[PDB]
């Protein structure tokens, strides 16, 4: 699912930040919510204030993993099933506080946390034992900022954008069965 990767990232970043800033009173620094719904930016929600917010902004397919095989061999028989769908995720981190400097401090700590950890997994950042997420940082031009924040309402806050590479989705359902080759006649 898509919720498990974001919960993993949230837990790890929460742990790091609250490790380095004990003064925050052990509250919830990181929440998962939609930024455009904030009251201060013209929305209706009045609970998004004084947080770091994670938002999913786009969803693309990986072109290199298309055309993978549609069958498997087992015990001399063929199992037919459709291949899975592999997706790249785009996550935006926004800092929203009534004090403009706290936002900058928390952005710096987000950046350095991603500077430290180059791989997110249950085996290395414990805090579904199937995920493996390699993030990277995206720097934009002014036209791309314009496109982004025009799609998000038209007002900026201190932010940063990351891409998480591979997430695979499929249904647990077989398609068919068959048998293999064991004898051949020529003429």
């Amino acid at each position: 699912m898509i919720s498990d990767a974001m919960r993993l990232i949230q837990v790890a970043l929460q742990r790091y930040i609250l490790e380095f800033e004990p003064e925050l009173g052990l509250s919830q620094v990181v929440i998962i919510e939609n930024i455009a719904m904030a009251e201060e930016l013209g929305g209706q929600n009045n609970q998004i204030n004084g947080h770091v917010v994670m938002s999913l902004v786009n969803l693309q397919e990986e072109t290199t993993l298309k055309n993978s095989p549609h069958y498997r061999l087992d015990n001399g028989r063929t199992i037919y099933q459709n291949p899975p769908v592999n997706l790249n995720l785009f996550i935006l981190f926004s800092a929203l506080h009534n004090q403009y400097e706290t936002s900058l401090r928390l952005l710096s700590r987000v950046v350095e946390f991603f500077q430290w950890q180059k791989e997110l997994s249950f085996t290395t950042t414990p805090g579904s034992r199937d995920l493996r997420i390699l993030p990277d940082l995206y720097s934009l031009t002014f036209e791309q900022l314009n496109h982004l924040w025009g799609a998000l309402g038209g007002k900026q806050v201190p932010f940063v954008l990351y891409r998480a590479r591979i997430l695979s989705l499929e249904a647990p359902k077989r398609q068919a069965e068959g048998s293999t080759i064991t004898e051949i006649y020529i003429n």
């Binding site: 072109t63 290199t64 993993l65 298309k66 055309n67 993978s68 095989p69």
Partner: protein, 142 residues
């Protein structure tokens, strides 16, 4: 059978270990024209008749994975004028994965291999390419 087909679901048999190619281009056939005219013909333009045949090279592109060095493996089997030739099969599949259009290539050996370029600011996957020569091509539809 009644709908036109799309162009994004295909497969390639090339005697290689892995599969999953990104781009396949170069599938053409041609014949040369020969022209002729004699002095007393009432029309003042030429007559045309068929000549010799011509075939093109085929290009394939795919992404790079750890542990896979197959393009280089095939290219590097070249002695003075001898090389390992293979039969190539390309097939287009439909929604139910049934081969619909098949291209059969005859005697194909790799003439060129190009690796990726490295950019400190490039947010893209690394892709490699191969270019192949052959002595024949045949189309089968339906």
């Amino acid at each position: 059978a009644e709908y036109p087909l799309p162009k994004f679901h295909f497969q390639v048999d090339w005697g290689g270990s892995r599969l999953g190619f990104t781009e396949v281009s170069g599938l053409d056939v041609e014949t040369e024209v020969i022209e002729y005219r004699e002095g007393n013909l009432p029309q003042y333009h030429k007559l045309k008749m068929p000549g010799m045949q011509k075939f093109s090279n085929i290009t394939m592109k795919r992404g790079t994975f750890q542990g896979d060095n197959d393009f280089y493996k095939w290219w590097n089997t070249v002695a003075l004028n001898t090389i390992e030739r293979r039969d190539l099969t390309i097939s287009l599949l439909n929604e139910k994965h049934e081969p619909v259009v098949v291209w059969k290539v005859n005697r194909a050996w790799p003439t060129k291999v190009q690796s990726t370029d490295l950019k400190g600011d490039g947010n893209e996957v690394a892709i490699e390419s191969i270019e192949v020569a052959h002595e024949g091509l045949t189309i089968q539809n339906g």
